[PDB]
Structures are given as C-alpha cells and as structure tokens.
Ligand binder design. Sequence first.
Ligand SMILES: [Zn+2]
Ligand SMILES: [Zn+2]
Ligand SMILES: [Zn+2]
Ligand SMILES: [Zn+2]
Ligand SMILES: [Zn+2]
Length: 74
Amino acid sequence: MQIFVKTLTGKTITLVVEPSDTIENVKAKIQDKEGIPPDQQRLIFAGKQLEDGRTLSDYNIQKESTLHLVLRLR
Ligand SMILES: [Zn+2]
Ligand SMILES: [Zn+2]
Ligand SMILES: [Zn+2]
Ligand SMILES: [Zn+2]
Ligand SMILES: [Zn+2]
C-alpha cells in the first residue's frame, strides 16, 4: 500500500504504509524524506484535518490516496 503526500511546494513524496499506520507514523516518514519537523506538518485528506493519533483506515485513506501538507497557521 502506498500513498502520496504533496508538500506545500507541490513536491510529491511517495510513502509505503499499512492501513493501521497512524498519522503520527506518516509524519515521521515525511520527516525522514524531507526534513520537515512533525510539529510543522498539518495533513489533510479529502478536506479532513488528520489527527496524529488516528489511522489511515480511520480516515478511509486507501491505496494511492493523496494527502496534502497545508499551512501550520498558529
Ligand atoms: Zn504491520
Ligand atoms: Zn507502519
Ligand atoms: Zn507496522
Ligand atoms: Zn519544533
Ligand atoms: Zn489535491
């Protein structure tokens, strides 16, 4: 299972994941790929704000889904 994360510049990160992976896990994988601190990362899928402790399957993120990194505002 893979997902795509688009960064704020539109760069695509491809990640190997499993349904149960937490969003926290995903943030760690993005840190490794791009050096973006997890505390600076805000993810959305299908307009939904994704919380660190919930899983990809909790959000119905599927094979080949795209997530966006969006502005950390405050
Ligand atoms: Zn496993
Ligand atoms: Zn995992
Ligand atoms: Zn695992
Ligand atoms: Zn920090
Ligand atoms: Zn999009």
